[PDB]
Symmetry: C3
Subunit: 114 residues, 3 copies
């Protein structure tokens, strides 16, 4: 899986351990190997949510499977919880785009998964 | 909705009120409530379009509905117009990916929109 | 087409010619005209792959057509090869999301491609 979070929170306010925590928590939530979860945090961004520049986050999660109605609700609670606790971003100011990728449409290690 | 624009134009060229203008203009164009529109502008990027590094922009608009043939043409006219007038980017050096997202695939406020 | 590569490799380690090389190699592999290929490289990112901070990359390729099983395998070999040779990123630390975009969902030049 691939998880990206873009935010206007400053870099200094991203705690040590955050990328590793996202990796472990996503492995637990998706069942996917932590070795093959990629995480990316982009602080200091020029962004607004509802016209306001208070802390916010725009995110994505891509996976081959493990994406669906009930799972995505669970991931949203998990990820909003982490962003609130670690980055002090309110959950009402977080968006996450989920993508159920076809195995043929993900490149990795010189090939795909199909 | 979520609107992102990445560009090689420098930060100092982005007008102070650009995020607010995008929010208001997208609410009018999509009919979506302004308090749910998120906007993100990323200047100073290392990019090329046709192998040239003249001003360009790569963008995305995600929305649950309000995406379609005629609507997307209208959004492109609006958004290319703003990028041309505000950032001095030629419309023929702008790409916008439109995504009609399922509500179950958009996380927000500890859940999804489904 | 649109190709984006986000990486933790530092900016100074991106060679002169990298964007031009990507543009030309993508035109050859896809058959798409190079004047319409956009490329974007984002170095110095805070990202991890498998919890590790060794060089890695998270990428996307969007195209109207030219996306499919065998084609995407070919693009992955090409792009991992370039990232390995030019940015010193191991292929097993590269993910690429492929998107076959409907022409009506690609904005350009004040309109769309359909
Ligand atoms: C059992 N096993 C073993 C190795 C593995 C290795 C990789 C994956 C895997 C990777 N993605 C993914 C990553 C980035 C994207 O942008 C989209 C999808 N989805 N699944 N899954 C497995 C897996 O399920
Ligand atoms: C009538 N009504 C009322 C409330 C509302 C509230 C929210 C939305 C809404 C949110 N998205 C969206 C945001 C971020 C994404 O990354 C993708 C999609 N699309 N629509 N729509 C409505 C809406 O249409
Ligand atoms: C034959 N011919 C001629 C002109 C042309 C002109 C443009 C394209 C074209 C552009 N995209 C694209 C760009 C950015 C995106 O974000 C998504 C898709 N895909 N194809 N294709 C052609 C093409 O195939």
């Amino acid at each position: 899986p691939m998880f990206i979070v873009n935010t206007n929170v400053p870099r200094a306010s991203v705690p040590d351990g955050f990328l590793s925590e996202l990796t472990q928590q996503l492995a637990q939530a998706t069942g996917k190997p932590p070795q093959y979860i990629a995480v990316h945090v982009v602080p200091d961004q020029l962004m607004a949510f509802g016209g306001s520049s208070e802390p916010c986050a725009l995110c994505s999660l891509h996976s081959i499977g493990k994406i669906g109605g009930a799972q995505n609700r669970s991931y949203s609670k998990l990820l909003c919880g982490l962003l609130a606790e670690r980055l002090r971003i309110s959950p009402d100011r977080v968006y996450i785009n989920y993508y159920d990728m076809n195995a043929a449409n993900v490149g990795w290690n010189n090939s795909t998964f199909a």
